[PDB]
Amino acid sequence: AHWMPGEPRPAYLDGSAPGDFGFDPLGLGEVPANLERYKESELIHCRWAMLAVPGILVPEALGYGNWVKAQEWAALPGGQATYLGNPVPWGTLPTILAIEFLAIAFVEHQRSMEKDPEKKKYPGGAFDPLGYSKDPKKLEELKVKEIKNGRLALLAFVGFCVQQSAYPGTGPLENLATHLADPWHNNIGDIVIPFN
Amino acid sequence: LSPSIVISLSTGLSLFLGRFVFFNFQRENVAKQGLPEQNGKTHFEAGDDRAKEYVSLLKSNDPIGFNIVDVLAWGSIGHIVAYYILATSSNGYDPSFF
Amino acid sequence: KGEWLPGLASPDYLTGSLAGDNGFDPLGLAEDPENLKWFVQAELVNGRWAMLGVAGMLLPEVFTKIGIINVPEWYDAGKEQYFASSSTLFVIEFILFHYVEIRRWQDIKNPGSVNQDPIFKQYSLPKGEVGYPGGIFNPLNFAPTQEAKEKELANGRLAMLAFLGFVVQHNVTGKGPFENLLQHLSDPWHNTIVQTF
Amino acid sequence: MRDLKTYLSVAPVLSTLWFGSLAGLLIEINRLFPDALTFPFF
Amino acid sequence: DISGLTPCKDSKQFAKREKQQIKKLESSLKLYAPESAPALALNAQIEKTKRRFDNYGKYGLLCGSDGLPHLIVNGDQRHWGEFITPGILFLYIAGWIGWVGRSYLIAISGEKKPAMKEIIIDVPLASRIIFRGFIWPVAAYREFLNGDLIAKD
Ligand code: CLA
Ligand SMILES: CC(/C=C/C=C(C)/C=C/[C@@]12O[C@]1(C)C[C@@H](O)CC2(C)C)=C\C=C\C=C(C)\C=C\C=C(C)\C=C\[C@@]12O[C@]1(C)C[C@@H](O)CC2(C)C
């Protein structure tokens, strides 16, 4: 377990934590309270991004959008979201912002008030149906799996955002389609090396 | 949505966040900062005879401790967000990014 | 091991232990031993890449002229159309060079660090000295004797200056290397640097 | 010559020799390559 | 054509400046005999002027409304030769000097009275140290990595 074999491990990164492959070049997690805050925020970023990747790929495969087309309707005054074709009757810009704020603020601020640093990241109980917590010998494996898939989804979200930045008006499945059609001449190389 | 509805809903949803959601955070931050300390002592403790924290206005009854000053604060945020909504909606402005 | 300028003495930092140690350090660069063991690796890699480069920009030309196989002349070889783009080659030459050069970096940082595969953890590499990995980098298993290392560094030092000669025989001449050799062998006393300038 | 090489080693004599040589170098370069505003040799 | 500047080989004001300076030199050339030495010096200056303007034409210099070569120092490759290719050629040479005079100061730092080598420069030691700064960038790089570049007080 090491992000780069041959590099020395930080003394505070032993490998016991889930996904602790010793990757701290800049030295951010040197004090332990900041490291617990960073673990909580890593898992939060991870869970949001890996929930987001289906919400980006699926509505582009079948939902008739491309994950930014789902936002353009709010940029134009007059027009509401096309949740699978049908328009939503819950208003367009301001009231969805009200519901989003009033819902996620309550959820995330009931998350904030937790003091146990393990429940701050792995609460369980109501958030653990199906009883996938009653055996730590596999729960550690599942925590490593969560961390790994979540870091993968975070990198995939960088892929989404930067493929949107390089190609302004497309989506990731269109990028994969272009790479499956002509894989050599339609890759990143035309952007890292701009011809003009 | 009529403007009375907008003002009432946004104010209600602001002091609802203040009464139930963002109360313990605001109050624990208040206790953390505590008071303005002039050379260790507070402003009233060092003297000045005018910076005394008023308690006749903050003693109001509530099982959780809501006071009239939080009613003004959550509610100033309320009227502010309401008028932001109202003016932003009444201004037919096209962001026209696309 | 020998001396490059007999009037001068080999410096104290070049004890003759290293391969190719003719005592050439007039400008005192490898005075710190860490700099010495870093510049050993820089010499080896620049020289091996220069050997491959010279062999890949001269041997095409001595085969183009005699007509065994027609291939471009190393400066018109970029503009040719290949099965990929002009930048896709750079993408691949980044993806799978970053991996091999950072592993070489971890080797020249601490020697015994990176010798086993990430995937097939059984197929390790023998504990060779730094800059000389061995194993699958030695399939024919020619021994890395010190005479062989000296021959390596000599051909590499020669190929480095050969590449420099190529770059300057295309920068202020315009023609290829082997064509310049044939021009020299045509009339050696009239086809030199002091006729071009 | 002993103690003349120490005088010529002194900071002003050595500075005037170095800057005379350097100034002649720059002067003859500007004769050879006058009126330069770019480096086009790459 | 960056920054709203026509190139100098195409700028009419640049050619007008050339013609104005050439006429200003020719009006001083009439007063001398055509075979005389002042006249030949003026003619050499005339050819120098003409090839100066031609060279500012061919080297990609950009001319403004005033009709003078402007330098685009931003980073455009077309104009690296205006600032960056000289600039590196400065930072090399300058960094030669400082890497020499520093190294000398480290080589005479361990003397008994090291101030009598500041005013009386050891020409052998200085000549040994001068070419150490030829390839100075790798020495400065490594000394930064080895910590020998910054004293530890
Ligand atoms: C700091 C502000 C400044 C700047 C940036 C310039 C810049 C310039 N001035 Mg101006 N000037 C200035 C102040 C300045 N001057 C002042 C204060 C005065 C009054 C004293 C003048 C008076 C003045 C006049 C009267 C003239 C200039 C000229 C020039 C140009 C110099 C051309 C030349 O001879 O260099 C050529 C390059 C060199 C001399 C450097 C050579 C260095 C040696 C040979 C080593 C380099 C090689 C080295 C070994 C590395 C090789 C790499 C590797 C192989 C090792 C240039 C545009 C001249 C010009 O052309 O007008 C535009 C001109 O006629 N200037
Ligand atoms: C790596 C290298 C060259 C690699 C070339 C390659 C891959 C070429 C590839 C290609 O051609 C092909 C195959 C095919 C083409 O289609 C494409 C390209 C891409 C063009 C050169 C290094 C070249 C390196 C050179 C020339 C280095 C010279 C160094 C010298 C002379 C050092 C001298 C000193 O440092 C010492 C030794 C000791 C100090 O104390 C004193 C001083 C004096 C400072």
Report the 10 Å Cβ neighbour count for A18. Answer: 19
Q: How far apart are CA A60 and CA A171, in angstroms?
A: 8
* Class of residue E25 by CB neighbours under 10 A (exposed 0-12, middle 13-18, buried 19+): middle
CB C132, CB C144: distance < 8 Å: yes
DSSP-derived letter for residue E78 is G
DSSP-derived letter for residue E69 is E
Q: How far apart are CA C178 and CA C75, in angstroms?
A: 13
Q: How far apart are CA E111 and CA E53, in angstroms?
A: 55
State the Cα torsion E104-E109-E114-E116 to the nearest 10°: 0
Ligand 2 centre to CA of A191 (Å) is 29
Whether the CB of B35 is below 8 Å from some CB of chain A: the reply is no
Place of tokens 């390559």: D33
Ligand 1 centre to CA of D29 (Å) is 9
Whole-angstrom Cα Rg for chain B: 19
Listed in sequence order, the residues at least 6 apart from C91 whose beta carbon sits closer than 8 Å to its beta carbon are A187, A188, A189, A192
Q: Judge E/B contact: 3 or more CB pairs < 8 A.
A: no
A152-182 core/surface letters (b: 16 or more CB in 10 A; e: else): ebbebbeebeebbeeeeebbbeebeeeeeee
Q: Which ligand is nearest to the CA of E59?
A: 1
Closest Cβ–Cβ partner in A77, A102, A105 for B94: A77
Ligand 2 centre to CA of C53 (Å) is 9
Pocket of ligand 2 (CB under 6 A): C 24-27, 29, 46, 49-50, 52-53, 56-57, 74, 77, 160-161, 163-164; E 135
Distances (CA, A) of A111 to A107, B26, B52, E106: 6, 15, 36, 61
Sign of CA dihedral C25, C26, C27, C32: positive
Largest Cα separation within chain E, whole Å, is: 72
Residue nearest to atom 40 of ligand 2 (CA): C25
Listed in sequence order, the residues at least 6 apart from A151 whose beta carbon sits closer than 8 Å to its beta carbon are A19, A46
Closest Cβ–Cβ partner in D9, D34, D42 for E120: D9
Name the nearest CA neighbour of A67 among A79, A59, A76, A78. A59
Sign of CA dihedral E90, E93, E99, E101: negative
Where helices occur in E34-136 by DSSP H, the ranges are 37-58, 80-107, 123-130
Report the 10 Å Cβ neighbour count for C47. Answer: 21
CB C64, CB C41: distance < 8 Å: no
Q: Which ligand is nearest to the CA of E95?
A: 1
DSSP-derived letter for residue A83 is E
Closest atom, ligand 2, to C-alpha of C72 = 16
E88-117 core/surface letters (b: 16 or more CB in 10 A; e: else): eeeeeeebbeebbebbbeebbeeeeeeeeb
E32 Rama sector, left if φ>0, alpha if ψ -120 to 50, beta otherwise: beta
* Class of residue C22 by CB neighbours under 10 A (exposed 0-12, middle 13-18, buried 19+): middle
Ligand 1 centre to CA of C33 (Å) is 39
CA distance from start to end of chain E: 53
Task: Give the length of chain B.
Answer: 98
* Residue C86 with chain A: CB contacts under 8 Å: 189, 193
Q: How far apart are CA A142 and CA B52, in angstroms?
A: 56
Is C129 annotated in a binding site? The answer is no
The values of phi and psi at residue B38, to 5°, are -95, 105
Sign of CA dihedral B78, B84, B85, B90: positive
Q: Coil, helix or strand for A73? A: helix
Q: What was the structure determination method?
A: cryo-EM
3-state secondary structure C89-130: HHHHHHHHHHHHHHHHHHHHHCHHHCCCCCCCCCCCCCCCCC
* Residue C102 with chain A: CB contacts under 8 Å: 4
Closest Cβ–Cβ partner in A6, A7, A188 for C91: A188
> Could you tell me which chains touch chain D, where touching means 3 or more CB pairs under 8 A?
E
This structure's resolution (Å) is 3.2
Pocket of ligand 1 (CB under 6 A): D 26, 29-30, 35-37; E 92-93
Whether the CB of A129 is below 8 Å from some CB of chain C: the reply is no
DSSP-derived letter for residue C182 is H
| Tally: H helices and E strands in chain B | 3, 2
C81-118 core/surface letters (b: 16 or more CB in 10 A; e: else): eeebbbbbeebeeeeeeeeeeebbebbbeebebbbeee
Ligand 1 centre to CA of D32 (Å) is 13
CB C29, CB E138: distance < 8 Å: yes
Residue nearest to atom 2 of ligand 2 (CA): C50
What's the distance, CA C134 to chain centroid?
A: 18
Helix axis angle, E137-146 to C33-57, nearest 10°: 140
Ligand 2 centre to CA of C50 (Å) is 6
Q: Which ligand is nearest to the CA of E73?
A: 1
Listed in sequence order, the residues at least 6 apart from C96 whose beta carbon sits closer than 8 Å to its beta carbon are none
Structure tokens at A170: 């497309």
Q: How far apart are CA E73 and CA D37, in angstroms?
A: 12
Where helices occur in chain A by DSSP H, the ranges are 32-61, 69-75, 94-112, 136-166, 172-181, 189-192
Structure tokens at A7: 């590099």
Q: How far apart are CA B31 and CA B53, in angstroms?
A: 13
Structure tokens at E67: 């009709």
Report the 10 Å Cβ neighbour count for C192. Answer: 13
Whether the CB of A112 is below 8 Å from some CB of chain B: the reply is yes
* Residue C32 with chain E: CB contacts under 8 Å: 142, 146, 148
Whether the CB of A194 is below 8 Å from some CB of chain C: the reply is no
Identify the closest residue of chain A to C90 by CA–CA distance: A189
Interface test with C, best of E138, E141, E148 (most C CBs within 10 A): E138
Structure tokens at C103: 């592993």
Compute the count of residue pairs across chains C and E with CB atoms less than 8 Å apart.
21
Name the nearest CA neighbour of B72 among B4, B5, B7, B14. B14
Name the nearest CA neighbour of C20 among C134, C162, C146. C146
Q: How far apart are CA E13 and CA E69, in angstroms?
A: 11
Residue nearest to atom 10 of ligand 2 (CA): C53
Identify the closest residue of chain D to E122 by CA–CA distance: D9
Structure tokens at A103: 């819902």
> Could you tell me which chains touch chain A, where touching means 3 or more CB pairs under 8 A?
B, C
Is C91 annotated in a binding site? The answer is yes
Closest atom, ligand 2, to C-alpha of C160 = 23
Q: How far is C135 from chain E (nearest CA, A)?
A: 31
Residue nearest to atom 3 of ligand 2 (CA): C50
- D42·E81 Cβ contact <8 A: yes
Strands B37-38 and A82-83: unpaired
- C87·A6 Cβ contact <8 A: no
Helix axis angle, B68-90 to A94-112, nearest 10°: 150
Mutate to test the pocket of ligand 1, among E48, E71, E89 (most ligand atoms within 8 A of CB): E89
CB A101, CB B22: distance < 8 Å: no
Ligand 2 centre to CA of C47 (Å) is 7
Amino acid at B96: S
Mutate to test the pocket of ligand 1, among E61, E68, E93, E99 (most ligand atoms within 8 A of CB): E93
Q: How far apart are CA A174 and CA A66, in angstroms?
A: 8
